[PDB]
Ligand binder design. Structure first.
Ligand SMILES: [Ca+2]
Lengths: 555, 555, 555
């Protein structure tokens, strides 16, 4: 009698402590499943949840190298608090100092080696490129390691993993749809990506998100996607996420062919997220391979339809922050893209590397990047793009000859910052829509409005409008000067108004007999010097266009 | 004995499968209530939860056309995972192509008709305006449909609905306070608004939020408010939300009278949210009716106190993104408003439609909008407002004569982008606080600093300061030119410095006898031509202000 | 037999109603603990949770003045829905009007006194400074009150408090690590800080966050940190948070010595958050004491290593909004800082007060601040910093002489807004990287490009390039004018091109005999007046640099 009442009035949950294997618990579960004791799993251990909609509450660890594979969870299933930990304590490198300066010297990086499940990462082949010479210097026991404790959700729909954490930990959603990794509680990564949505088989992934939370370390990228397409609804991607110290990149959409098909991604959101101190890049949102690319795209659009780097990727990209990359802050490719509100600070390589065409970039800030001169420039754009608002330069100087922006096919407006103008290369730069203007000068005895024709010279101003103090401060007097370059000497030739408060115009004249072709316009005169009589002459182009030579000033 | 122990140590939850009706389960529930089987409800089915603080966990569907009404939930009650689904599969339209281009032709829209619970929406009367002629062309079976499966929370305080989803689904909070719709899991909408806080009766709504999540489709607006006032504490609104493909608008505060009282809203937050591909508008934050307005405001401030469009709405509006609207990206009205950090891209109608007065807009970006020329301009502001930072123009051209910004009573500073200056209309445009300036020119043999007096001509520059190459690249030589318009020919009259590297000033003279009134200032001279003697003359205004005519240059 | 089955298949939870004290329930709990009845606690009541990982679900109140202390919760424990309420109803002040105008007059503030647990705050000693004279005017029963109902989590790791609320409520994490205050459900504060992470004893705090949610009222700061260091991983801080009407500041990192050691903080995130209507400041992110500072830093870096205000605080600060402060919107100190995307509106004191050195500020907007002239300026920067993008001025005027920006050691670029240029003081202001420029003028018969040398005069332009209409609108004619200041009269001396459509240049001449030193450059001439013969003369500096005087124009 009581049993009838009790079966109706109490919440169903079983606990793993009461079962000899995880499958035994899974098979018996109805609603709740509590992980209340640490569970040692073998790599490839596979649990069949019978299509049941389960709420898996974790208050202990899953311990093992390799993958713990969950299958046949019903839509609406949730896994909370999971903690993955490897059995192996690998050798890790820590390529930064106790003052958070990046180490770049291979020998210094090797000297950091320790056995730990955190506070660094296992070297991989990409480290051989990142730290040149390290391949030879690393001891064999620190090369080729492959330690990750991975929770794999396999071929499920509508499963969410919440508040996950771990040590040498990874989370893989393989062949899943409408799944989410929510509020990741700072798992410390292993050899593989920390959060992966991989859909190389089956239908293109859709509805797969990283929402909130953060990760640390890992040998490769923190959050990554293969063969996902969010549809026009943009149903997938990364929102509200933080990546710290990825061994590769913070957020990565894969490029090129993986196995026999495309790993590329379309129609995802990348918004409201932060990547700090990646060893490679902050955001890597390209789809085509840059160096030595495939000649085809099996499973994707052919090269005949869209050239390399010109896929209609159509991601929704907004409100991203990157700081401290040892590689590139923000990288992408594609055609027809809109990108907005990107802030990149203090990166050793380019702040932005944009292999894009017919794309628009709005309100971009690239602040103290390429600080180790790893790339040619701070921001590169290959194709014919538009940039509307670009902040350049924080507090760092540049000693060498590298460009700040090289966007040779792009049209740009709204640069702010103490950029060295010789380090700008664009197709067209303009402020078409300014109002009435004032140039305010501080810390000088003059104010200047300068002109520079980059075709003539990228390094020398070709003319200027100046105002210069006469006397000293408080004099109530200045002179205005209109200048032109000659013989590569800026300001060589000039007209002045009010020099020494004289209230007159000082007019330059041709220092010898003027040639006919020196005068440009009709109804104008050009003064010139006749030294043989101590006279000024005037070459006059009359209103009718004919030339005459007159005497202008005499002894 | 065991029963005493068990009653104390187990969590209380009952499951709907054990009860014949939802009311029977509600009446028996203590703490938890599990929806473990699909439940078919009749429209208007009303459940009385006895004031109990319940945690309702949904792992199955509520199925029915019409409203499932929950009442008398205690403060702190939570409903998670709810899934609403209609019994009717209606006719829906899908006014976009397989390349995500909007369809605007009525006949093309009619051709998209299919029976589905998603992937489109049921036509409503607003479609008759949006797609002109469609009212005549739609078959009768596709007109006037009214399918929604709505969870209605009625007259409750402190109830939260989390992770809701569905098909033809809606969520209505009627007469509620301190309620939230949290992390909406992409419900696909029906005929009515997807998320509604309606407080037409009782106290003004307060504490009501949409937090996080997203919605898709629906015939009308995704998230909407009637008669809510967040108080000075700004306790309500929309934060962190995404709307896709609203049949009307993404986020809407209602305007005008509904029933017998005001539907307007005050003191709400609209922040950190995204609206993509609405059929009408991204954000519709107006309170007064634009076309054919009421002559009064029953239940609100009278017109005598605040004129139409001048209510002190006082919303907190920041960090919003809109892309792809078929209507207006961002619309509002009100007086005394501050708005910041708004980004609008790729809209067919105006990017921003601002019926505002004595309001401030900071860091606005309106990028490639009014692309179908549906409105007069890309950004319109009616009243006397201030705009501080305005990015205009992405990559699209404008073939016709429409203005980009028409803000005739507004003062604006900080435009960036390749705007056509003839398409700017403002009360005042200025950059008062620039430093020393350099104009850098790429892709031309000259650099230019131009002036345009819009009262004189909106299409022609009235004067310029140029620098032009002498010779070719690398010559180290340029000439500076100061010009003025005459006879509507820009640059008609000019003074040059260093033309052809001559190191002299070429000075324009009056091509005939100068009239007395041609000279402006004392202690100045004006050269002019005397053709009858092949002489230059000078009209001199002496230091004492009197005129004299002198001979300046002779044969 | 049934008991064996039941013990395995039901979720364990006990409820406080079944136990005489909270400790009795804690001791018996296994998994869940339900707070189902209001519980009156005594101040200092301490509960030992036995290291157990518990899920504490609150559906009733903890009632008491003083602290309810939770200890020995296991990592992964969660407390949801907690509601703290005092037993005392104190006297509170409400220093704002029914139109949300701040009250500043002490007598007016005293007149607001009422007994309530909300809608105002208990006066503290800081109010004596904020409202001068109020110390004398407050009745003794409204002074020195100390009412807070505080949930204290003591020396725990990995505990999260979710959806907390209350009246006169506070939340203290003392000596905790890896703890979070998540989705605070608008608790109304008491005398102490609403959310505090205090780590004065033990290891520096790390992993401690406020994530999401909001608070209202309180006598002091809403969210605050003492002796936390997030490490290079930036593992702690405030993300996604809203503070309303703090009695002191919205978000505060403490400064100086507290007790015997440092209260300072390093390496925290402050992002994506909003502070509205604080009585003092929006964000107070300083570490050193401004007024009457300590001569040392026990427990921290010594002054010999880092001077006052020059600590390497290294916080990650981005995407913050402040509106309506009665004090300062955004304040900080430190050296080597990067700060981005800060928006401050409508503050009575300075929008930003930056005691920083060698720091970079990118995309800052300070809009209508120092509105009550409480400080010297709207934005102050003490040290040698860089500002890249600064929006100034909304719609408010300034009647007095206060500066807008005073950043005397800083280099700034990219100011936008209707700033009064006389109210800018910086070390250097420049736009180095503009393209070809157009100045568009509306509402005037002229367009202007002005120059101002602040060393000469902060209030008068020293020269200008103008374009002015000849005739009226549509004439197709303008004149260009190049001017210079003399005798503190702007535009006193000028050269014109095309005045009255004459097609000639009007040239100013020296109104008397020119002195030798009036001419600057070789191969130039300077016209001057010889009144005794009604002649223009020319002072000529020949190509060889020697002077000669010629006759230029004669009767
Ligand atoms: Ca002469």
């Amino acid at each position: 009698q009581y049993s009838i009442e009790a079966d109706k009035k109490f919440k169903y949950s079983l606990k793993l402590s009461d079962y000899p294997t995880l499958q035994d618990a899974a098979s018996a579960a109805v609603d709740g499943l509590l992980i209340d004791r640490d569970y040692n799993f073998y790599g490839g251990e596979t649990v069949d949840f019978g299509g049941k909609v389960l709420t898996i509450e974790c208050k202990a660890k899953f311990i093992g190298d390799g993958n713990l594979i969950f299958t046949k969870l019903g839509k609406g299933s949730r896994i909370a608090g999971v903690f993955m930990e490897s059995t192996t304590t690998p050798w890790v490198i820590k390529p930064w100092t106790d003052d958070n300066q990046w180490l770049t010297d291979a020998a210094a990086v090797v000297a950091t080696l320790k056995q730990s499940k955190t506070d660094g990462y296992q070297p991989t082949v990409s480290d051989y490129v990142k730290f040149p010479g390290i391949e030879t210097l690393l001891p064999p026991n620190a090369k080729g390691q492959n330690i990750t404790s991975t929770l794999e959700i396999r071929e499920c729909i509508g499963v969410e993993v919440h508040r996950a954490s771990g040590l040498m930990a990874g989370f893989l959603f393989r062949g899943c749809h409408f799944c989410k990794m929510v509020d990741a509680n700072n798992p410390s990564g292993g050899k593989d990506g920390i959060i992966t949505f991989e859909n190389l088989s089956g239908d293109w992934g859709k509805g797969n998100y990283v929402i909130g939370g953060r990760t640390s370390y890992g040998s490769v990228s923190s959050a990554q996607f293969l063969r996902n397409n969010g549809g026009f609804e943009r149903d997938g991607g990364v929102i509200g996420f933080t990546s710290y110290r990825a061994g590769e990149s913070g957020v990565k959409t894969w490029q090129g062919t993986v196995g026999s098909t495309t790993s590329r991604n379309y129609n995802l959101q990348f918004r409201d997220s932060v990547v700090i101190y990646p060893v490679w890049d902050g955001f890597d949102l390209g789809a085509d391979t840059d160096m030595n690319p495939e000649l085809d795209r099996p499973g994707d659009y052919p090269i005949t339809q869209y050239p390399l780097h010109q896929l209609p990727l159509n991601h929704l990209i907004d409100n991203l922050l990157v700081r401290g990359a040892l590689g590139v802050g923000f990288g992408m490719d594609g055609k027809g893209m809109y990108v907005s509100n990107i802030t990149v600070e203090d990166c050793a390589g380019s702040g932005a590397y944009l292999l894009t065409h017919e794309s628009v970039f709005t309100n971009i800030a690239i602040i103290d990047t390429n600080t180790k001169d790893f790339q040619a420039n701070q921001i590169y754009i290959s194709g014919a793009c538009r940039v509307n608002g670009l902040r350049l330069i924080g507090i760092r100087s540049t000693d060498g000859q590298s460009l700040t922006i090289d966007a040779p096919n792009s049209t740009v407006s709204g640069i702010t910052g103490m950029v060295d103008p010789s380090r700008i290369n664009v197709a067209n730069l303009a402020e078409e829509g300014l109002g009435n203007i004032r140039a305010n000068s501080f810390g000088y005895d003059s104010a200047a409005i300068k002109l520079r024709i980059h075709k003539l010279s990228k390094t020398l101003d070709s003319g200027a409008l100046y105002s210069h103090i006469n006397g000293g401060a408080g004099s109530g007097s200045a002179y205005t000067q209109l200048t032109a370059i000659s013989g590569s000497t800026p300001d060589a030739v000039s007209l002045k108004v009010n020099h020494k408060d004289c209230r007159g115009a000082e007019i330059p004249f041709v220092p010898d007999i003027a040639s006919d072709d020196f005068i440009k316009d009709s109804s104008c005169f050009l003064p010139y010097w006749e030294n043989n009589s101590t006279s000024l002459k005037a070459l006059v182009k009359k209103p009718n266009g004919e030339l005459v030579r007159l005497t202008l000033a005499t002894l």
